[PDB]
Design an enzyme around this catalytic site. Sequence first.
Site, mmCIF file in Angstrom:
data_model
loop_
_atom_site.group_PDB
_atom_site.id
_atom_site.type_symbol
_atom_site.label_atom_id
_atom_site.label_comp_id
_atom_site.label_asym_id
_atom_site.label_seq_id
_atom_site.Cartn_x
_atom_site.Cartn_y
_atom_site.Cartn_z
ATOM 1 N N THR A 42 -103.933 -91.761 29.878
ATOM 2 C CA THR A 42 -102.987 -91.981 28.789
ATOM 3 C C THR A 42 -102.118 -90.756 28.534
ATOM 4 O O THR A 42 -100.991 -90.889 28.044
ATOM 5 C CB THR A 42 -103.734 -92.369 27.513
ATOM 6 O OG1 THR A 42 -104.646 -91.322 27.155
ATOM 7 C CG2 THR A 42 -104.511 -93.656 27.727
ATOM 8 N N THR A 43 -102.617 -89.562 28.856
ATOM 9 C CA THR A 43 -101.842 -88.348 28.631
ATOM 10 C C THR A 43 -100.744 -88.183 29.675
ATOM 11 O O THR A 43 -99.611 -87.820 29.336
ATOM 12 C CB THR A 43 -102.766 -87.128 28.632
ATOM 13 O OG1 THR A 43 -103.735 -87.260 27.586
ATOM 14 C CG2 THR A 43 -101.967 -85.852 28.413
ATOM 15 N N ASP A 82 -107.367 -87.123 23.813
ATOM 16 C CA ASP A 82 -106.907 -88.327 24.493
ATOM 17 C C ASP A 82 -105.619 -88.814 23.838
ATOM 18 O O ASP A 82 -105.589 -89.070 22.630
ATOM 19 C CB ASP A 82 -107.985 -89.409 24.445
ATOM 20 C CG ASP A 82 -107.627 -90.635 25.268
ATOM 21 O OD1 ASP A 82 -106.580 -90.623 25.950
ATOM 22 O OD2 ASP A 82 -108.398 -91.617 25.231
ATOM 23 N N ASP A 90 -114.259 -93.360 28.766
ATOM 24 C CA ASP A 90 -113.249 -93.144 29.796
ATOM 25 C C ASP A 90 -113.879 -92.978 31.172
ATOM 26 O O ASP A 90 -113.261 -93.334 32.182
ATOM 27 C CB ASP A 90 -112.397 -91.922 29.451
ATOM 28 C CG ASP A 90 -111.492 -92.160 28.258
ATOM 29 O OD1 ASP A 90 -111.293 -93.336 27.888
ATOM 30 O OD2 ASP A 90 -110.979 -91.173 27.692
#
Lengths: 535, 50
Positions: free
Chosen positions: A95-96, A62, A401
Site C-alpha cells: 500500500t505504501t 502501513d 500482511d
Amino acid sequence: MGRPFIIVKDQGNKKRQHGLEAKKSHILAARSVASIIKTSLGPRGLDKILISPDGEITITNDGATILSQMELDNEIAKLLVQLSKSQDDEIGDGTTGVVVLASALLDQALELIQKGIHPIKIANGFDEAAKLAISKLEETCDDISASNDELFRDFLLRAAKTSLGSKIVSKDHDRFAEMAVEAVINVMDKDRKDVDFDLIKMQGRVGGSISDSKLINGVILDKDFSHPQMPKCVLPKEGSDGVKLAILTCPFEPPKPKTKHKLDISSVEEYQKLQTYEQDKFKEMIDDVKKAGADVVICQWGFDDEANHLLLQNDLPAVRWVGGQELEHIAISTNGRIVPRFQDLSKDKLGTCSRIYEQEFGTTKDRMLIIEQSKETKTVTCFVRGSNKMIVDEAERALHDSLCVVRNLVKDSRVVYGGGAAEVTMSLAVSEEADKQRGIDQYAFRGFAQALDTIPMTLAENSGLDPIGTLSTLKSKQLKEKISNIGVDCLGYGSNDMKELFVVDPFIGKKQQILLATQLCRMILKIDNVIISGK
Amino acid sequence: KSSGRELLERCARTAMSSKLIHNNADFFVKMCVDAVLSLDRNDLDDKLIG
C-alpha cells in the site's frame, strides 16, 4: 439583470477551480501525501502516530491504515485513501509503494502539461507504457511451481521475511516467519491449492512479550467456565482421545414457545403437576449428554443456577455466553456438527479436542479457552503477545500482511525479486521503446520510466545510500547483464544481489502497483472543473 | 449482408470515448456487446444489467 445572481444553490460555499493553476494545485497536493510516507518505504521505514477523535491512538507505518481514519479536505488525496484501501483489500501488501508511485506519475506529468501536451495525451501514453513494463517483467519472471513441496516451503519463507522487515516484528524474522507459513500449510490442498483465508483466525492478547507468541491450532475463547470449581485441564480417559465436544445453540432453560403464551393453572392440583414437570426436564437434559458421552457443552445463553451445578456432579464442564460466530468456528476444527436440539444429539455430531486447559494472565482476572489438536486440523488461530496495546495491534497488522503475501503465492506461483530490482527492470524497458518509436509519445514514455525510478531512489535515500550512485549502478548491470536480480540493498550488505539475500516478492503484488497507480492518475489529469462545497 | 455481431461492436466503441474506457476498450467492449445478446430482442431491461 439586477444585483442578485443565482443559478446553483449555495454559491458562497461552492468554489470553482479551473485553468492551468488547477492542475498545478492538485498535483503538488498529492505529492505532500506521498512525501509523508516516503520515509516509511522499505525496512528502514518509520512508523506514524494516528490519533482518533475519541482519544484512541494507533502507531503504524502501513499506508492503508495511515490514510484510513484520517480527516482530509482536498478530494485528490481522498482518492489516495481509497487507493491504499484497494491495494490492501485484494493483495494485502504494497500500500505504501502504490501511493508513492501514483504521486511520481503526477510529478512527471506536471512538467509535461506546461509543455503544451493535452493531459489525456499524457495519460494515454501511460497505459501503453504500463503494458510494455508488465510484459517485460513477465518474461523474466521465474516459476517456482516446478519444484516439490519440500523446496516450496522455503519459498514461502523468502516472501514472508521480506514484508516483516518493515514492521516492529522485524526483530526476529526467522522465528516469526514459521507462524505465518505453517498456519497456511494446514489449509492447503496440495493440489489446485486455495488459501481460504476464512479458516485462518487472528486473536491478539495484550501482555507478556512478543517472543512468547506461538502458533496454536484451535479456537481461542475469552469466556470463563460456568462454574469455578471444575478442573482447568480436560484430558480423555483410556481410549477415544476425543473429548466428545458438543456444541448446542439451545442452552438449558425451561421449555417455552417463542410466541407470547399464557399458562393457566387451576388451584393446587395443576400447580403440583407442573412442579414435577420441570424437575424431570433437568433429569432429561442430563441423560441426553451422558447417553451420547459428551463432555463440554457450549451455548449462546448462560445456564440457569440449577443447571450450573447439575453438570458439575457428572464431571461435565460447560462454557456459557459464547457468541454466535464463535460457535461455528469451533465445529470446523473438531470435525463436529452443531446440535440444533436436545432430541438430535448424537455421537456423530460430537467434536474432538486433544487438550483443553484454562489459561490465566498475571494478576488480572480473565480465563482464555485454548483448544489444541495433536493432528493437522481444518483451522488455525494466531496467538500474539506484546508489551504494549499498540505493539499487539501492530503485530496483528504485521502478521496479517505476512499472511496476505503467502496467499498470493498459493494461487500464482510466479514471483519476482523486489527491493529495487523489479522497478529498474521495468523502467529501462520503456526507455528502450521510447527512442525507437519517437513521435509525440516519447515524452510520455520517458516520464513513466523516470517515475518508476523513484521507488529504488527512495529505498536508497532512507538507507543512507546515494541515489545518484545507486541508480547509475543498477542501470549498468541491468543493461549489460541480462540478470535482473540486481536491486537496491537497504541493509548494506557487500552484494547487491537480491537472490542471495532471500528477498522474494509476489508478482501479483508488484503488478497491481503500476496498474492501480496508472489508472488513478489518468482520471486526475481528466479533472478540470473542481466544485467544492464548504461544510 | 454483414454480420449482426460486428454491427453492435463498432457502435459500442463510439460511446466508450471521453471516458476512462477509451484505452481499455479492447477488453471492455467485448463485455457489454455480449450482455445485450443474452437479453431477449423483444424485451430489453436495464435492471437486469445492474
